[PDB]
């Protein structure tokens, strides 16, 4: 018993995280058609480098969480 205390702080942090990430997707999508509205490139390389750097604190799994957000925003390359 008593473990279900944090299994609600988990449940909170998750639908919260989910909500944030639910948004960040379209914010990238927004920058997406935006920059592309002016003959711009779908992706910006050094920027995704900056996003990857953001989550480095998390350790080695940082870059791979970053790359999920990036896929969620600007989609899968070549599709």
């Amino acid at each position: 018993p008593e473990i279900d205390t944090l299994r609600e702080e988990i449940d909170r942090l998750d639908a919260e995280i989910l909500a944030l990430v639910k948004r960040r997707a379209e914010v990238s999508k927004a920058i997406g058609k935006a920059r592309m509205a002016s003959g711009g490139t779908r992706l910006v390389h050094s920027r995704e480098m900056k996003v990857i750097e953001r989550y480095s604190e998390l350790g080695p799994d940082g870059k791979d969480l970053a790359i999920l957000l990036l896929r969620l925003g600007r989609g899968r390359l070549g599709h």
Partner: protein, 452 residues
């Protein structure tokens, strides 16, 4: 300081090949070198007896592998220096360009989950076309070492026909080495990918590519664990100089057992944008030779012209005999490429759709040097993939200009090469090559595009 070759003192073509070939060379040819027709004729007589750079059985084999690309079952990687220099025709340079191609091929192979055909811009890429016949410094234009000298003197920019022999001699030397490298330990996939895991460790952008370099490492170890334990690199150059290609022609029984004409200066050659006159001698030369051929298609290409190329160069519907190399620039590929694909695909001919994200994205820099932005190259290949995925057609390959050297000729990438860096290591003799770091970066990214 120079050596000297004697001028000799080969069997006759069947009458039809005699006629079609003479007919084809009779037609107008752009961008050919100006030099005495009797000196050029002396050169071509030397070159008509020399040991070939390639042999027919190898071109037939490439034709078969390219048919698998055409049919959606393999992927074409074509790469190398923009212009080969007799100066840099050296082992370390060749080795690093072979290594660079082999590395990109492992990455691309895992991404495509199908075989990659490796073709190098090497062993003949000694000639380029020039838009203007007088260059920045009021000098006659440099056209590649098959023609004249990169050196910026009035005397160096004179068109020297002896550079025909000098070009063959360099070519077969580099080819000899390429053959030796690809049958040595350099070809081993496990060795070749450790070079790639080095790149991930030492690169600024390793994080972007580490998950995938590790997925590949596990694919290679998976092979070994199952009980597995070499390489084929084909030679190609732009067939620009008809005097040269003429001499290197040899006659041999072909795909059908009847005698055909093979151009043995390479395995495959491509006509470029400034030489694809539909009724010109380049395109007509391409109709007599058995080699796989390609045609550059830039932004002024019409679906209907593209189809005429397909019907002239692929008369027998031999899948993979014709490659169509798209170079539109990223802002134009998504709009211009689809109509061409739809109409060509409709003919029933199986062409290879090769992307060229380089010759449509050049731009003079604010330093005086001509450069290309990494992010624009990516965008066109990406855009090239987006268009083929939308149509259900095959993204058949890429065509990049690269070196195995850490030159600084293209912007951006993992090294954020800036406009003030393009002067630190601008080695190229013509167009800005992606250094090895940007080569692999693109190979990783194009591999991501290939996945699903």
């Amino acid at each position: 300081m120079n050596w000297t070759v004697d001028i000799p003192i080969l069997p006759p073509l069947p009458t039809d090949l005699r006629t079609r070939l003479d007919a084809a060379l009779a037609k107008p040819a752009a961008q050919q070198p100006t030099w005495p027709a009797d000196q050029a004729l002396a050169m071509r007589t030397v070159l008509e007896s020399v040991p070939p750079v390639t042999v027919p059985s190898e071109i037939v084999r490439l034709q078969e592998q390219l048919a698998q690309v055409a049919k959606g079952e393999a992927f074409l990687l074509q790469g190398g220096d923009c212009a080969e220099t007799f100066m840099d025709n050296t082992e370390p340079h060749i080795r690093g360009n072979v290594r660079a191609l082999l590395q990109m091929a492992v990455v691309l192979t895992y991404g495509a989950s199908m075989p990659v055909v490796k073709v190098a811009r090497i062993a003949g890429q000694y000639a380029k076309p020039r838009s203007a016949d007088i260059d920045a410094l009021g000098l006659r234009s440099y056209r590649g070492d098959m023609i004249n000298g990169f050196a910026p003197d009035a005397a160096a920019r004179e068109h020297d026909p002896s550079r025909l022999v000098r070009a063959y001699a360099n070519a077969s030397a580099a080819m000899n080495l390429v053959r030796a490298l690809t049958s040595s330990g350099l070809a081993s996939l496990h060795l070749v990918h450790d070079w790639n895991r080095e790149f991930v460790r030492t690169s600024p952008a390793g994080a972007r590519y580490e998950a995938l370099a590790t997925e590949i490492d596990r694919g290679l170890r998976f092979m070994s664990a199952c009980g597995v334990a070499t390489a084929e690199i084909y030679a190609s150059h732009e067939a620009l100089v008809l005097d040269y290609e003429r001499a290197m022609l040899r006659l041999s029984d072909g795909d059908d057992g009847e005698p055909q004409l093979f151009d043995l200066s390479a395995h495959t050659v491509w006509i470029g944008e400034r030489t694809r006159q539909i009724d010109g001698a380049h395109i007509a030369f391409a109709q007599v030779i058995a080699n796989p051929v390609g045609v550059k298609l830039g932004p002024n290409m019409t679906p209907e012209l593209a189809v005429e190329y397909v019907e002239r160069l692929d008369p027998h519907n031999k899948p993979g005999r014709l490659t169509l190399v798209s170079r539109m620039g990223n802002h134009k590929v998504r709009d211009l490429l689809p109509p061409i694909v739809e109409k060509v695909q409709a003919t029933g001919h199986q062409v290879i759709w090769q992307c060229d994200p380089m010759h449509g994205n050049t731009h003079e820099s604010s330093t005086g040097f001509k450069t290309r932005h990494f992010d624009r190259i990516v965008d066109e290949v990406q855009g090239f993939f987006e268009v083929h995925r939308a149509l259900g057609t095959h993204p058949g390959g890429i065509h990049v200009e690269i070196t195995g050297e850490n030159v600084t000729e293209c912007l951006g990438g993992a090294q954020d090469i800036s406009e003030t860096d393009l002067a630190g290591r601008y080695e190229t003799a013509c167009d800005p090559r992606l250094n090895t770091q940007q080569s692999l970066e693109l190979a990783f990214l194009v591999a991501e595009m290939l996945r699903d």
